Structures are given as structure tokens and as C-alpha cells.
Design a protein around this ligand. Structure first.
Ligand SMILES: *[C@@](O)(C(=O)NCc1ccccc1)[C@H](C[C@@H]1CCCNC1=O)NC(=O)[C@H](CC1CCCCC1)NC(=O)c1cc2ccccc2o1
Length: 220
């Protein structure tokens, strides 16, 4: 597997969106990964509707703006057999009745794959499959002030994550070796947060913040 991977420069990731005041991080993570997979198959890069997920994934278990899984989002997409585009079903940052329109479905999936709970499997997945949906412990206020560099929270749980995000690749900082590796992760808090809306999470630090513990990607 290569030493550095970035899928943005290959056309798998869309611009960084802002999720506002609504607990839909799982939505954006799931979409992002599914956009990557749809690009891997068709070659087209279309922005997918998060509001479709927020409103219409009840039966699968998600709670709209009160949290939800990405596996449940993928299951909803498979059972509903489609997903509307962002432009057709825009994101309004509030739960509503389902307004799904099969005439505007631009993506499909056939199920999900859960990655084992070690970082090696995560790396292999990001290298071979593409952008991956993962979860991290971001409850601490230090994560709120991230700007640049590798992020390391000493009091980061490897087992209790509260935030869903999208790993788009990985690399190193070419300074003195060891504790120089990082996961490239796309947050959904806007472009003004961090590195244009991105973050560098600790990599090969024994599953820092559980980034490799709730990893999955949809099948297409
Ligand atoms: C996520 O971080 C988000 O969408 N926004 C951050 C945020 C939090 C609070 C206000 C504004 C913005 C959410 C955050 C939760 C939702 C809001 C309430 N408090 C939260 O912490 N994170 C999630 O939804 C996580 C995502 C990960 C968690 C670990 C691995 C799986 C996915 N999921 C849940 O919180 C969740 C999922 C389910 C499913 C069934 C029942 C309950 C439930 O809760």
C-alpha cells in the first residue's frame, strides 16, 4: 500500500459543506462515502442530499437531527433503492416529512461493508476502495479550535465516539520521524473550520479517538 493517499485530487470528494445546528454528521459522512463509491463506478461526481437521509431514514433507526448511524443510512438507501441529489432535495438543517422523489435519484447502493477495528484494515480500505465513513471522539473543546497540523487529544476515547466523519486519505509530515503520520478527514462544519474544513487526525497511535473502530463503506 502507498505511503500517502489523497482522493480529493482524484475526483472522489465534493466541496466542504456546513451542517449547521442539527445532529446530521452521520448524514454527511454516509453521503460523502457514497459519493466516492458512485464516482468509482460511474465516474460522475454529484452532490447528494443529506436532508433525504435526515427525514426518510426513520424506519432504519436514525433520529433525524438527534443522531444516527451511517450503516443505517446505507440500509435506508438500499431498501428505498435510491437517493435524491442535493440540488433536488436541498439541506435545510431541520427534520421534516419525507419528500423523496424517485425522479431525482442519482445514486444507489447494495449494502455496506464494515472494516475491522485495527488501523491496518482502515488503511487498506482507503487505499483500495476510496473515501471511508468513520467516527471519532470529538466531544472535547480542543477539537473545536483546530486550525492546522496533526490533531492529538490526550484524553481521546478509543471506544466512545460521538462524531461521524469521512476519511479521504492519509500521509505524513516530513519532519523528524515517528508520530508524523495522519489521517486526512473531512468535517462538515464549513470551510472556515480547520484546514479549509479539513483535519489531520493522529495515525498509527493505537487507534487514537477510535477513528478505525467504527469504519464502513457502502457497496455499489
Ligand atoms: C454528530 O456529531 C453531528 O451530527 N453534529 C455534531 C453536533 C452535535 C450537537 C449539536 C450540533 C452538532 C452527531 C452528534 C449527536 C447528535 C446531536 C445530539 N448529541 C450528539 O452527540 N453524532 C452522531 O450522531 C453519532 C455518529 C457516530 C457515533 C459513533 C459511531 C457511529 C456513528 N451517532 C449517534 O449519536 C447515534 C446514533 C444512533 C442510532 C440509534 C439510536 C441513537 C443513536 O445515536
Amino acid at each position: 500500500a502507498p505511503r500517502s493517499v489523497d482522493w480529493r485530487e482524484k475526483g472522489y470528494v465534493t466541496p466542504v459543506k456546513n451542517q449547521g445546528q442539527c445532529g446530521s454528521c452521520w448524514a454527511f459522512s454516509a453521503t460523502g462515502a457514497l459519493e466516492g463509491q458512485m464516482f468509482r463506478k460511474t465516474g460522475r461526481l454529484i452532490s447528494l442530499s443529506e436532508q433525504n437521509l435526515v427525514d426518510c431514514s426513520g424506519p432504519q433507526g436514525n433520529e433525524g437531527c438527534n443522531g444516527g448511524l451511517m450503516d443505517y443510512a446505507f440500509q435506508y438507501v438500499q431498501d428505498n433503492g435510491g437517493l435524491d441529489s442535493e440540488e433536488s432535495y436541498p439541506y435545510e438543517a431541520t427534520e421534516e416529512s419525507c419528500k423523496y422523489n424517485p425522479k431525482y435519484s442519482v445514486a444507489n447502493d447494495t449494502g455496506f461493508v464494515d472494516i475491522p477495528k485495527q488501523e491496518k484494515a482502515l488503511m487498506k480500505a482507503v487505499a483500495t476502495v476510496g473515501p471511508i465513513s468513520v467516527a471519532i471522539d470529538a466531544g472535547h473543546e480542543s477539537f473545536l479550535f483546530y486550525k492546522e497540523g496533526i490533531y492529538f487529544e490526550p484524553d481521546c476515547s478509543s471506544e466512545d465516539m460521538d462524531h461521524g466523519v469521512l476519511v479521504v486519505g492519509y500521509g505524513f509530515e516530513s519532519t523528524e520521524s515517528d508520530n508524523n503520520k495522519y489521517w486526512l478527514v473531512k468535517n462538515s462544519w464549513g470551510e472556515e473550520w480547520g484546514m479549509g474544513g479539513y483535519v489531520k487526525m493522529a495515525k498509527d497511535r493505537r487507534n487514537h479517538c477510535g477513528i478505525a473502530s467504527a469504519a464502513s463503506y457502502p457497496t455499489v
